[PDB]
Amino acid sequence: PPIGPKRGAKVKILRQESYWYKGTGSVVAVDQDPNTRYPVVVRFNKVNYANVSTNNYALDEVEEVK
């Protein structure tokens, strides 16, 4: 049993200080090793103000959409 959403899923962001907040992104890797507080790696379709397109997130800041 692994953790988190599946690889390449479609998830919605709930971290309101995020640029992509209430938007969606695609999972690319979920660090399985505990002691990491932000395992999920999400890649987005648009860049933010710092010209970055990927970010780490916790498990509860991510909600699977369909």
Binding site: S18, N55, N56
Partner: protein
């Protein structure tokens, strides 16, 4: 002296420490990330407040933050 704070979303890329022009920041060992690294700010009495560190941080939102505070001789960058 300004304030500089490090938040636990840090990925330990060290880009902020490389950028500081007055050597305020430092890397210290940790266990909360793949790098086992975290930034710290032990020498904030020398911080000029340029936010050169914030331009370098890649996390969203920032993991290093500079709050401008009471001014001194070193903080203002006065050579006289």
């Amino acid at each position: 002296s300004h304030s500089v704070k490090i938040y636990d979303t840090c990925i330990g890329c060290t880009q902020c420490v490389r950028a500081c022009p007055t050597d305020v920041l430092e890397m210290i060992p940790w266990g909360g990330c793949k790098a086992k690294q975290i930034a710290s700010a032990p020498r904030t009495e020398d911080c000029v407040g340029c936010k050169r560190c914030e331009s370098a941080c890649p996390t969203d939102f920032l993991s290093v933050r500079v709050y401008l505070w009471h001014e001194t001789t070193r903080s203002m960058g006065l050579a006289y």
